[PDB]
């Protein structure tokens, strides 16, 4: 059990106690996904409006 | 000095953010009008509190913060509340109608329409930073905005600020205060999509906060206000190292370095003590050994789980108040012989300790008694995976019958995203088992 | 934010008028549109149901529809009749003769465009419209046939808004004509496709409650409507006052509707109190909770003990212990856990509002999505089939241009609905 | 009333408890995946402890201590006694054991074994595992037998001088039943059993297993005249105490039972900080079966601990009643004591 890296200041202090040693999608790809979801909403709405027109 | 921008998403993120900034102002001596008498440099400076507050020529201390919600009623309380003069109107962003507890509605349908406005307002904050560290993002798992819009925002922040650290404070759903049946769905969907974009995430289970409020503060039926004031105390003890002079966790990258050896396993368990009722007429001040030992009690954790049956990868002790290193070490020595504290074999068995001499500040008239010393322990233990198992199980029950799935598909999400997200969570559970078993 | 209310036909306008009487009183609005309340909780969400006119005047966002003028003349003459916007009265002269085809295809089709003109005008002055609520019966002609025609037209123009109905189900015990099972089966066919939430208010249950529970020897429609307006006040409490849970139509639908076709709710209320009857006794939180879950207190004539709850919403009103309410709500689930499906965890949600309804210190309103509701559609289907296998009374409908095939399809769709409930009752 | 689920059907002890539970009229059994239970008769393997104690309005009790497999698995127990300060490697009531993988102790065992050949002392060992036994006097055949299988084995000192019941010149092992409730009170059942051997103990050839292994299955099948001295090779405590008074002028309490209570309290208070469910969000209790050996000096040795034990036939009614009385009714109260409290 040893204390290392003791730092002190007027606001407090910090140190480390050791007990035992050891033994992304791009902008375009995001917009693609958002627009694909939008198109799926649009298709589903178009199907509804086609049904109501019948 | 290196700045930090806080982002508060949805009702939970916004209301907790209000609790936090109220507490930050009390801790730094900033008045609700933004003035700070103890700050002798008018309209400038690079002190430690400047990491969270900018300054105007008039001496107003302005939070480096953006509040985002898809309906206006929660942020409206900020616009007319005690600290209304603190925030610039550009920092408070509201839509018209919310995500209706639907991840797909917050992420795809409404998120697509508002994401660029939010990034523009964040850029206005970033443009006033000489050396931005990154972002602290506050949000619920269960809400449609907190889950769905946050995951979109995290993705775009990785694009726009690739070199910046991103930390999360996430509210894990509890039926005792929950508002939606589909919260397990939203939690898994947002965890899958955010996982590769978050460097360190502090999960707070509302059930644990609720029970701590009942058991230790004698609150019969805790409200969000009760919960949020306790949560802000824990958040404040976690972020104090960024806001005050010190040497431990002085920048966002150091949270990952000190707590997350494996990138996917980036959810540290927080434990806080003491939580004492302000209504108690006579208080007995707990010693360093007693509050340190309380850190290994499940009843004091932000997520109920049993660390005796997992392994530790890292452990950080954050003391506030009348604490000296001599007493911390005598406490750690005693606890090691009486507690089940097993580290993984490829990690040192040790503690990084930080002490701030200023005792915890409490809100006047709140529920928390003023104490002379407090501690927040941040520990990366595999036992937090119990929380994923509970969540993944409720997901499985509903998804086997496809209950409520049509609400998500109707917003343009594919049904395959459910199973993709659930498979990612299955691999996450397996990762915890490999490290800890 | 804003809700647009429509009431169609005799039943729809009589229960709609009483609904507006009750909530106007709760929000402190007098019969002339002036606010005279004492609590700011009354005005905080007033815009959900009322437009603001100059002079501090609150006007219901209500459209009154009928194919004959009689009931709407009575509404103008009634207690709060002066509160409605006079341009929002839309009516014909011919009537619908208790005939779904006249409401849906002939007489109603002539009037429907001018109703949509008033709907459009109300929607256009909405800051952010949530959706629509319709009150009507399913057993007549205007509310059933023209009401469902209106729903379909409104969906066409506002496909992304929530559509909610309070639908009064016919019963032989409280019946005006023998063709009610035809009109109701044709209407349910429409409701399964075009509404998001339907409150099933069964005149059979309402009569039984007035007779057995309230000890009313000869129940009238007025007595029945007292139960409905109290239930409607209760189920809209979360929309009208500040609160966290089921606070708008979409969040309620997301919490209550796990499968799009299974959106037919059984409502209930406690304490059950009759017209002009004052009982002064205090009702404890345990007594409210047990009574709101009691089969005898349900307003759809089906037995919840024969099925399982997919989802439940409960609303408590009045000053009471929130700890006790949580404890009692958990007590019911933990002691009778078989009546709640296990594959929807935590499917009972509780809300609490401080403002109690008039005449009571506390009350509780129940909204259940129970698989036992299949018994209601089974009952309608049997009464439909008894007549349809002999083609009895069909000439009233073929004379309006309808074909028998449309009846067979509507019956088939309702029997499918019954089968889908039974499927999740065994899952 | 109270509710419970059943995830482990084969428990003869918790079947009788489940039957007794229903027989009270105040208990009701739920389905398997219904989370609204007061009591879980959980599975022995892979029990989802992580999902317990998170149901608002339910005191949840499971019939197992999570982490009690340390005391109940053979290699785990040998590692516990050696590495625990409260138990020590110098533990005098536990036979010298060595964990041997096919963390290993092959050299440490060869050192003490060869010591026994230098002094010509009794050098008979036994290989066993919680997965499956081979008694030998030569070390080259015990290590070869651990490698033919593929699991962890222990090599324990075989007690060459046991106490022998007369007439018969026969071997026995004692089973004690210990109930530890949610408050971690240690309750030792007043009734134990002696699983005796049917054929005379034979130290010449460890080949014939029947006279050396006292298990009820190995005696029910491999021994002729099985159950000729006592029904089912089971001598209960009133008969063994009478034999000890007649044959040895001592009692079962003095010569044997004080040591048994000592060992039970040693092992259980040892792991108590690592498994206790005090201040945990779900409570636990567990019935344990200790297996003891008595040598010719009337000294008690610990052999193993079973966390999922079966009960003797004539003691099913009394013990399961005590399980319901002390463990379950103390947590869920219904609208003389058969246990000895070890404190
Ligand atoms: C929990 C879901 C509910 C199903 C039930 C079986 C419920 C459950 C409880 O009432 C909350 C039972 C109630 O405590 C008592 C024991 C006093 C009961 O004697 C009252 C009348 C009988 C009952 O029927 C058996 C009643 O009419 C009903 O509904 O009982 C359906 O909504
Ligand atoms: N601790 C805490 N939890 C909150 C608070 N507000 C909401 N929650 C929790 O957050 C979850 C609900 O999500 P919200 O944040 O309200 O939803 P949202 O982000 O606004 O998303 P939508 O309303 O669906 O658009 C539930 O589990 C609530 O219990 C709060 O102020 N404090
Ligand atoms: N060191 C030793 N000295 C003398 N006999 C021993 C011994 N180790 C084991 N035995 C004998 O071997 C038998 C079985 O040993 P053990 O108890 O390890 O097996 P097991 O786990 O299958 C029993 P159970 O089915 O009761 O749990 C015992 O009844 C005992 O008589
Ligand atoms: N509860 C209730 N039911 C009514 C009322 N008026 C009519 N009904 C029922 O409504 C059905 C008749 O429809 P009605 O509304 O009168 O015909 P419409 O004018 O064509 O819509 C029958 O089932 C009646 O029992 C009423 O005021 N209250
Ligand atoms: Ca300054
Ligand atoms: Ca990144
Ligand atoms: Ca005409
Ligand atoms: Mg919200
Ligand atoms: Mg009529």
Residue D21 lies in a domain: yes
Sign of CA dihedral B6, B11, B12, B16: positive
Residue B11 contacts residue B76 (beta carbons within 8 Å): no
- Number of structural domains, chain C? 3
| C292 CA to centre of ligand 1 in angstroms | 10
Q: Which tokens hold the place of B328?
A: 């911390």
What CATH number is given to the structural domain containing C207?
Answer: 3.40.50.1440
Residues D203 and D335 in one domain: yes
User: How far are the Cα atoms of D192, D211, D214, D243, D292 from residue D299, in angstroms, in the given order?
Assistant: 17, 21, 18, 16, 10
Burial of residue D340 (CB within 10 Å: 0-12, 13-18, 19+) is middle
Residues C141 and C23 in one domain: yes
Q: Which residue of D has its CA nearest to C335?
A: D1
| A to B CB pairs, distance under 8 Å | 111
Q: What is the 3-state secondary structure (H, E, C) of chain A?
A: CEEEEEEEECCEEEEEEEEECCCCCCHHHHHHHHHHHHHHHHHHHHHHHHHHHC
Ion ligand 8 — residues with CB under 5 Å? B 11, 98
Residue D87 lies in a domain: no
Distance CA D320, CA D41 (A): 14
B308/D67 CB distance under 8 A? yes
Distance CA D28, CA D48 (A): 22
Any atom of ligand 2 within 6 Å of the Cβ of B411: no
Query: By residue range, what is the domain housing residue D268?
Result: 68-72+163-342
Residues C8 and C155 in one domain: yes
Q: Which residue of B has its CA nearest to A7?
A: B247
Q: Which residues of A are less than 8 Å from C155 in CB distance?
A: 48, 52
What CATH number is given to the structural domain containing D291?
Answer: 3.30.470.20
Say which residues have a Cβ less than 8 Å from residue C35's Cβ, sequence separation at least 6.
C27, C28, C29, C42, C43, C46, C56, C58
Residues C218 and C282 in one domain: no
Q: Which residues of B are less than 8 Å from D48 in CB distance?
A: 389, 393
Pick the last residue of a domain from C238, C267, C296.
Answer: C267
Residues C125 and C274 in one domain: no
Residues D40 and D171 in one domain: no
What CATH number is given to the structural domain containing C368?
Answer: 3.30.1330.20
Q: Write down the H helix ranges in C195-248.
A: 203-208, 221-235, 237-240
Q: Which of these is catalytic: B22, B55, B183, B254?
A: B254
Residue D307 lies in a domain: yes
Any atom of ligand 1 within 6 Å of the Cβ of C290: yes
| D16 CA to centre of ligand 7 in angstroms | 79
Whether the ω angle into residue C143 lies within 30 degrees of 0, i.e. cis, is no
- What are the extents of the domains in chain B? 3-259, 269-387
Residue D137 lies in a domain: no
C343/B403 CB distance under 8 A? yes
Residue D124 lies in a domain: no
Select from B8, B10, B11 the residue to mutate for testing ligand 2; criterion: most ligand atoms less than 8 Å from CB: B11
Say which residues have a Cβ less than 8 Å from residue C354's Cβ, sequence separation at least 6.
C41, C317, C318, C319
Query: Quick one: B3-259 is in which CATH superfamily?
Result: Tubulin/FtsZ, GTPase domain (3.40.50.1440)
Beginning with the edge strand found earlier in the chain, give each strand of the sheet holding B165-172 in spatial order: B92-94, B65-69, B4-9, B134-140, B165-172, B200-205
Residues C193 and C290 in one domain: no
The per-residue DSSP string of C12-41 comes to HHHHHHHHHHHHHHHTTB-TTSBB--S-GG
Q: For an interface test with B, which of D33, D36, D46, D54 has the most B Cβ atoms less than 10 Å from its Cβ? A: D54
| A to C CB pairs, distance under 8 Å | 9
Distance CA C251, CA C423 (A): 25
Any atom of ligand 1 within 6 Å of the Cβ of C398: no
Residues C322 and C383 in one domain: no
| C71 CA to centre of ligand 9 in angstroms | 9
Residues C92 and C38 in one domain: yes
H/E stretch holding B135 reads strand B134-140
Query: By residue range, what is the domain housing residue C220?
Result: 2-267
C334/D3 CB distance under 8 A? yes
Q: Which tokens hold the place of C424?
A: 């999740």
Residue D319 lies in a domain: yes
Distance CA C366, CA C268 (A): 5
Any atom of ligand 3 within 6 Å of the Cβ of D158: yes
Residues D299 and D170 in one domain: yes
Q: Which residues of D are less than 8 Å from B338 in CB distance?
A: 273
DSSP C370: E
Nearest CA residue ID for atom 22, ligand 4: C139
Q: Which residues of C are less than 8 Å from A52 in CB distance?
A: 152, 155-156
Closest by CA to B164, choosing from B129, B135, B122, is: B135
Nearest CA residue ID for atom 27, ligand 4: C11
H/E stretch holding D99 reads strand D97-100
Residues C371 and C384 in one domain: no
Distance CA C236, CA C238 (A): 5
Residues C28 and C65 in one domain: yes
What CATH number is given to the structural domain containing D49?
Answer: 3.40.50.11480
- Range D206-231 burial, b when 16+ CB lie within 10 A, else e: beeebbbbbbbebbeebbeebeeebe
Residues D170 and D299 in one domain: yes
| Per-window interface: D 115-154 vs B, CB < 8 A | none
Residues C334 and C355 in one domain: yes
Residue D205 lies in a domain: yes
- Please enumerate, by residue number, every residue of C annotated as part of a binding site for GTP: 10, 68, 137, 141-143, 203, 225
- Number of structural domains, chain D? 2
Beta bridge mates, D39: D4, D61
| D97 CA to centre of ligand 9 in angstroms | 92
Q: Indicate the pairing of strand D186-189 with strand D172-180.
A: antiparallel
Whether A17 has its CB under 8 Å from any CB of chain B: the answer is yes
How was this structure obtained? X-ray
CATH top-level class for B269-387? alpha beta
Look at residue B1 and give its three-state secondary structure: coil
Residues C213 and C276 in one domain: no
Residue B53 contacts residue B62 (beta carbons within 8 Å): yes
Residue D212 lies in a domain: yes
Residues C209 and C289 in one domain: no
Pick the last residue of a domain from C209, C233, C267.
Answer: C267
Nearest to C343 among B100, B221, B401 (CB): B401
Closest by CA to B13, choosing from B228, B238, B271, B190, is: B228
Q: Write down the H helix ranges in C93-220.
A: 100-104, 107-124, 147-157, 180-194, 203-208
């Amino acid at each position: 059990m040893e204390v290392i890296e003791l730092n002190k200041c007027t606001s407090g202090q910090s140190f480390e106690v050791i007990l035992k040693p050891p033994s992304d999608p791009s902008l375009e790809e995001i917009q693609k996904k958002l627009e694909a979801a939008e198109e799926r909403r649009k298709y589903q709405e178009a199907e509804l409006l086609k049904h109501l027109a019948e | 000095m290196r700045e930090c921008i806080s982002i508060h998403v949805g009702q939970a993120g916004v209301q907790i953010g209000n609790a936090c900034w109220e507490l930050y102002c009390l801790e730094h001596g900033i008045q609700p009008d933004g003035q700070m008498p103890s700050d002798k440099t008018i309209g400038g400076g690079d002190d430690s509190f400047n990491t969270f507050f900018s300054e105007t020529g008039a001496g107003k201390h302005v939070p480096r913060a953006v509040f985002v919600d898809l309906e206006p009623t929660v942020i409206d309380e900020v616009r007319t509340g005690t600290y209304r003069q603190l925030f610039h109107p550009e920092q408070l962003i509201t839509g018209k109608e919310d995500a209706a507890n639907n991840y797909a509605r917050g992420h795809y349908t409404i998120g697509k329409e508002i994401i660029d406005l939010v990034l523009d307002r964040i850029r206005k904050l970033a443009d006033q930073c000489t050396g931005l560290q990154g972002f602290l993002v506050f949000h619920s798992f269960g809400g449609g905005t907190g889950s769905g819009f946050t995951s979109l925002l995290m993705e775009r922040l990785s694009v726009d600020y690739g070199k910046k650290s991103k930390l999360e404070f996430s509210i894990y759903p509890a039926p005792q205060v929950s508002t939606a049946v589909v919260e397990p769905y939203n939690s898994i969907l947002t965890t899958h999509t955010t996982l590769e974009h978050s460097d360190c995430a502090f999960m707070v289970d509302n059930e644990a906060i609720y029970d701590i409020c009942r058991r230790n503060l004698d609150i019969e039926r805790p409200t969000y206000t009760n919960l949020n004031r306790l949560i802000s105390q824990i958040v404040s003890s976690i972020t104090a190292s960024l806001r005050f002079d010190g040497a431990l966790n002085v920048d966002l990258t150091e949270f990952q370095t000190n707590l997350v050896p494996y990138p996917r396993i980036h959810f540290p368990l927080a434990t806080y003590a003491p939580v004492i009722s302000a209504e108690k007429a006579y208080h007995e001040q707990l010693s360093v050994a007693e509050i340190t030992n309380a850190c290994f009690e499940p009843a004091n954790q932000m997520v109920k789980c049993d660390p005796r049956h997992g392994k530790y990868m890292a452990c950080c002790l954050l003391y506030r108040g009348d604490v000296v290193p001599k007493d911390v070490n005598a406490a750690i020595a005693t606890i090691k012989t009486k507690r089940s504290i097993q580290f993984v074999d490829w990690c040192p068995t040790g503690f990084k300790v930080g002490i701030n001499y200023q005792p915890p500040t409490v809100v006047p008239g709140g529920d928390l008694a003023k104490v002379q010393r407090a501690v927040c322990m941040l520990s990366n233990t595999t036992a937090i995976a119990e929380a994923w198992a509970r969540l993944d199980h409720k997901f499985d029950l509903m998804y086997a019958k496809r209950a409520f799935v049509h609400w998500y598909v109707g917003e343009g999400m594919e049904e395959g995203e459910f199973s993709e997200a659930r498979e990612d969570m299955a691999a996450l559970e397996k990762d915890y088992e490999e490290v800890g078993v | 934010r804003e809700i647009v209310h429509i009431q169609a036909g005799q039943c729809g306008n009589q229960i709609g008028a009483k609904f507006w009487e009750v909530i106007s009183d709760e929000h402190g609005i007098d019969p002339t549109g002036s606010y005279h309340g004492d609590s700011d909780l009354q005005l905080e969400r007033i815009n959900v149901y009322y437009n603001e006119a100059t002079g501090n005047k609150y006007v219901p966002r209500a459209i009154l529809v009928d194919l004959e003028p009689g009931t709407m003349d009575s509404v103008r003459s009634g207690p709060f009749g002066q509160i409605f916007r006079p341009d929002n009265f839309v009516f014909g002269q011919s009537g619908a003769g208790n005939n779904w085809a006249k409401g849906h295809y002939t007489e109603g089709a002539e009037l429907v465009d001018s109703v949509l003109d008033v709907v459009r005008k109300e929607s256009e002055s909405c800051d952010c419209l949530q959706g629509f609520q319709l009150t009507h019966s399913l057993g007549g002609g205007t509310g059933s046939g023209m009401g469902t025609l209106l729903i379909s037209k409104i969906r066409e123009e506002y496909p992304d808004r929530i559509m909610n109905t309070f639908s009064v189900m016919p019963s032989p015990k409280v019946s005006d004509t023998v063709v009610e099972p035809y009109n109701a089966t044709l209407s349910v066919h429409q409701l399964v496709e075009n509404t998001d939430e339907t409150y099933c208010i069964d005149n059979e249950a309402l009569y039984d409650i007035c007779f057995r529970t309230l000890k009313l020897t000869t129940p009238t429609y007025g007595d029945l409507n007292h139960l409905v307006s109290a239930t409607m006040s209760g189920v809209t409490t979360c929309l009208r006052f500040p609160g966290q849970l089921n606070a708008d139509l979409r969040k309620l639908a997301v919490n209550m509707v796990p499968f799009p076709r299974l959106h037919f709710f059984m409502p209930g209320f406690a304490p059950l109190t009759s017209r002009g009857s004052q009982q002064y006794r205090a009702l404890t939180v345990p007594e409210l909770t047990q009574q709101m879950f009691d089969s005898k207190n349900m307003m759809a004539a089906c037995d919840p003990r024969h099925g399982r709850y997919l989802t439940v919403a409960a609303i408590f009103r009045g000053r009471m212990s929130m700890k006790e309410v949580d404890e009692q709500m958990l007590n019911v689930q933990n002691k009778n856990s078989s009546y709640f499906v296990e594959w929807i965890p935590n499917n009972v949600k509780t809300a609490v509002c401080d403002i109690p309804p008039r005449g009571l210190k506390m009350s509780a309103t129940f909204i259940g999505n129970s698989t036992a509701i299949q018994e209601l559609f089974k009952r309608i289907s049997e009464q439909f089939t008894a007549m349809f296998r002999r083609k009895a009374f069909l000439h009233w409908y073929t004379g309006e241009g309808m074909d028998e095939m449309e009846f067979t399809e509507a019956e088939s769709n309702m029997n499918d609905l019954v089968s889908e409930y039974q499927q999740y009752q065994d899952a | 009333m109270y509710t419970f689920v059943v995830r482990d059907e084969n428990s003869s002890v918790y079947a009788e408890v489940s039957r007794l539970l229903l027989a009270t009229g105040q208990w009701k059994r739920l389905r398997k995946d219904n989370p609204r239970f007061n009591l879980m008769l959980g599975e022995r393997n892979r029990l989802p402890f992580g999902r317990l104690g998170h149901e608002p309005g339910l005191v949840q009790l499971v019939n197992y201590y999570r982490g009690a497999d340390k005391l109940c698995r053979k290699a785990s127990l040998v590692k516990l006694i050696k590495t625990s300060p409260e138990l020590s490697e110098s533990c005098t009531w536990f036979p010298e054991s060595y964990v041997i993988y096919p963390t290993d102790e092959r050299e440490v065992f060869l050192a003490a074994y060869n010591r026994r050949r230098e002094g010509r002392e009794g050098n008979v060992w036994i290989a066993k595992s919680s997965a499956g036994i081979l008694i030998s006097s030569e070390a080259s055949e015990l290590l070869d037998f651990i490698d033919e299988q593929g699991q962890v084995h222990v090599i324990q000192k075989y007690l060459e001088k046991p106490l022998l019941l007369e007439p018969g010149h026969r071997k026995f092992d004692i089973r004690s039943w210990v109930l530890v409730d949610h408050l971690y009170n240690i309750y030792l059942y007043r009734e134990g059993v002696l699983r005796t051997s049917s054929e005379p103990y034979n130290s010449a050839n460890f080949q014939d297993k029947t006279c050396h292994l006292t298990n009820h299955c190995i005696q029910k099948e491999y021994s002729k005249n099985y159950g000729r001295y006592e029904e089912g090779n089971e001598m209960f405590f009133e008969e063994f105490n009478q034999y000890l008074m007649d044959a040895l002028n001592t009692t079962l309490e003095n010569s044997i039972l004080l040591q048994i209570k000592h060992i039970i309290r040693s092992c259980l208070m040892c792991i108590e900080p690592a498994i206790s469910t005090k201040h945990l969000h779900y409570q636990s209790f567990q019935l344990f079966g200790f297996d003891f050996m008595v040598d010719e000096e009337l000294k008690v040795w610990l052999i193993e601990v079973n966390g999922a034990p079966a009960c003797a036939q004539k003691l099913y009614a009394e013990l399961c009643q005590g399980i319901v009385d002390v463990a379950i009714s103390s947590v869920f109260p219904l609208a003389t004591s058969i246990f000895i409290k070890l404190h």
